[PDB]
Design a protein around this nucleic acid. Sequence first.
DNA 1: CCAAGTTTAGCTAAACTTG
DNA 2: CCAAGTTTAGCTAAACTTG
Lengths: 95, 96
Amino acid sequence: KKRLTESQFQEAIQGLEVGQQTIEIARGVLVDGKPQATFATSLGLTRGAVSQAVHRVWAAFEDKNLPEGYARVTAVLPEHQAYIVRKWEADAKKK
Amino acid sequence: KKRLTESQFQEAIQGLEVGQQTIEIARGVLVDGKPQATFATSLGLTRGAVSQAVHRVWAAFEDKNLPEGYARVTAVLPEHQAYIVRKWEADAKKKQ
DNA sequence: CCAAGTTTAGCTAAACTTG
DNA sequence: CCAAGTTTAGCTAAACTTG
């Protein structure tokens, strides 16, 4: 279901520390739409591996694909600092 | 360094998905102060595998709250605000 | 039902951080 | 420089979830 255009894929793999196999896997799956089973079959890899491989590149895209000048952060914080962050995301969701 | 008593360890392991070897390993370095290196030698393991096992028990205890006015927050912010949030988490990980 | 995809403890390699 | 510890991609297993 989840897929990436050619250019979104190129963005996601920009400087991403990842082997060439992982790149090929995600390319066939996210861009060319091939099932993950094919790379499991053809590479002799378990279903887990291929899925983790595609996941990295997808997560990479999600770590980008944010308005430039922004970044996603997550943490457990005190009630006060938790409150401030709540507001900041609201103000961020105005621009 | 980072160590635990028996009550904290029995609290750490409480509810954690974890085999028996990982409990052993963590008990040795967190509770009994034994180095991680000796556990690699006896169990025939790389340094990393032993380090992952310790971390899992240590993290579970650090994730046993304890001020729950605290809350898990996730947000998409500009870098200047993101930096502060990253700084805040880093304050929180020292204070605990 | 069947097939495919997800998830996570546990491992190694290996490069990196600490003291 | 070394020793001990940390980190993380990549892999399995196996139980779980989606289509």
